Design a protein around this ligand. Structure first.
Ligand SMILES: Cc1cc2nc3c(=O)[nH]c(=O)nc-3n(C[C@H](O)[C@H](O)[C@H](O)COP(=O)(O)OP(=O)(O)OC[C@H]3O[C@@H](n4cnc5c(N)ncnc54)[C@H](O)[C@@H]3O)c2cc1C
Ligand SMILES: NCCc1ccc(O)c(O)c1
Length: 433
């Protein structure tokens, strides 16, 4: 009676929540698998996360699922103390990881600089624009101005030198999963607000703890709780919200309400009748700022490596992640432009490593191009200029659920999908009561 489109974390958790409340549901999943943009799979000799990877106990929704499905102790920190390399003026600079972090810490201090006035409650991101806002006019003006400013311009304008600029440029190529110069700096400021405004905490939350048993231990857990079979290989083609849903084969399914978790980068596969609001339609057409890609590279030997490179490098942040039995290292990498790298080309993977070193030898590589993926069309959702205040909040019988619309760790984190999936089901629940 309630139709959930997509079996990623938002869809699975919404179904479990409806089930709790005794409401009939059905999940229609385009792919032949569950997990969506979280995808644990054996590649290159071990389970690797092709999408979502890191977790933290300060992420409320993720951490309760970690507790629920038995992974409390089953988390491991990514290697630290790497030999660090960063490109800053056509040149490769060699340092320690702590050397890099302290440069990034001071720049982050400036980047967060008004989060305390914007986000007293870091989970009320649009409070400044609320009728309830009790602050001065000049804070609302700085807020809107920040939505139209990118995060690197904030560091440039504070007088930092070119070294620190290319470091933040590389950082946000990875963080904004695409071109950071088109991004909204209010995203970065809210990550600060959710991280006690400390670079170190922000990295502990987003870039440290991995699930020993992968994301699949969680989404297999949620799916294992459901008493209604997920209909895989059932891509949705049309949605009528007056609700009626039409699959690609032409099957028609009737429903009291529709919870659509299809990411924006993939909504163009579905026709809506009536059409979507013009405001929301312009977001879909502009979509999100996530055009980048994530790679897994394997090299010869055991090397503790960290590398940073600004736009337009193939990869902006690359880091050792696993030391393997056969004297190899698996590194992870994040880059701003999915179309500048073939994630499964040993030669393109070598050119990534060649950004910093001419003595490290790639022997394998792999990745999934989420942006080119029909059912995704993006990496993790990040914000263009103007999308903090006129973007993710515009998607509020038809409900949109997904990390990209979350109040808290929006887009970038499974925490956001688990948040928004659950609260969107509550909207359904509340209105049926
Ligand atoms: C490279 C990468 C790395 C990430 N790393 C992390 C990390 O370390 N930590 C973290 O917390 N988060 C991370 N994330 C983010 C996390 O994966 C997402 O925020 C979360 O999985 C989004 O869940 P969702 O349910 O909102 O969307 P999705 O996972 O995209 O779920 C949508 C589902 O709908 C399906 N679908 C699409 N179109 C249709 C259609 N027409 N009909 C039917 N079904 C359809 C899709 O197949 C998919 O199963 C990462 C994301 C990426 C891309
Ligand atoms: N994949 C985790 C998302 C992410 C990307 C870049 C960062 O700089 C960061 O702190 C977190």
């Amino acid at each position: 009676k309630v139709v959930i489109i997509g079996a990623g974390f938002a869809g699975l958790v919404a179904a479990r929540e409806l089930q709790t409340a005794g409401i009939e549901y059905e999940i229609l999943e385009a792919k032949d698998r569950i997990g969506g943009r979280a995808w644990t799979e054996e590649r290159m000799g071990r389970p690797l996360e092709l999408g979502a990877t890191w977790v933290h106990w300060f992420q409320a929704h993720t951490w309760t699922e970690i507790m629920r499905y038995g992974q409390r102790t089953e988390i491991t920190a990514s290697p630290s103390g790497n030999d660090a390399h960063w490109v800053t003026d056509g040149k490769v600079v060699k340092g320690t990881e702590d050397d890099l972090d302290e440069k990034l810490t001071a720049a982050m201090g400036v980047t967060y600089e008004g989060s305390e006035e914007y986000f007293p409650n870091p989970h009320d991101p649009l409070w400044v624009l609320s009728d309830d806002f009790d602050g001065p006019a000049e804070v609302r003006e700085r807020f809107l101005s920040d939505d139209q400013t990118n995060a690197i311009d904030l560091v440039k304008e504070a007088g930092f030198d070119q070294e620190t600029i290319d470091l933040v440029d590389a950082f946000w190529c990875a963080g904004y999963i695409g071109d950071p110069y088109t991004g909204s700096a209010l995203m970065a400021k809210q990550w600060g607000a959710l991280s006690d405004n400390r670079y170190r905490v922000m990295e502990d939350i987003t870039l440290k703890w991995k699930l020993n048993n992968g994301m699949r231990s969680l989404y297999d857990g949620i799916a294992g709780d459901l008493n209604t079979d997920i209909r895989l290989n059932t891509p949705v083609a049309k949605v009528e919200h007056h609700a009626t849903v039409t699959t690609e084969s032409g099957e028609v399914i009737e429903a009291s309400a529709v919870i659509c978790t299809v990411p924006v980068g993939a909504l163009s596969n579905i026709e809506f009748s009536p059409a979507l609001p013009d405001a929301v339609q312009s977001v879909i057409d502009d979509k999100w700022n996530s055009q980048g890609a994530k790679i897994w590279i394997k090299i010869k030997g055991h090397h503790r490596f960290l590398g940073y490179a600004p736009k337009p490098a193939k990869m902006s942040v690359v880091r050792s992640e696993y030391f393997m039995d056969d004297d190899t290292t698996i590194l992870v990498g994040f880059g701003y432009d999915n179309t500048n790298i073939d994630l499964n080309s040993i030669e393109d993977a070598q050119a990534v490593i060649n950004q910093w070193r001419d003595d490290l030898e790639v022997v394998d590589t792999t990745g999934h191009n989420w942006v080119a993926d029909k059912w995704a069309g993006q990496a993790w959702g990040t914000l263009r200029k103007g999308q903090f205040t006129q973007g993710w909040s515009l998607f509020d019988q038809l409900f949109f659920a997904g990390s990209d619309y979350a109040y808290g760790w929006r887009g970038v984190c499974v925490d956001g999908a688990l948040e928004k999936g659950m609260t969107t089901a509550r909207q359904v629940i509340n209105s049926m009561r």
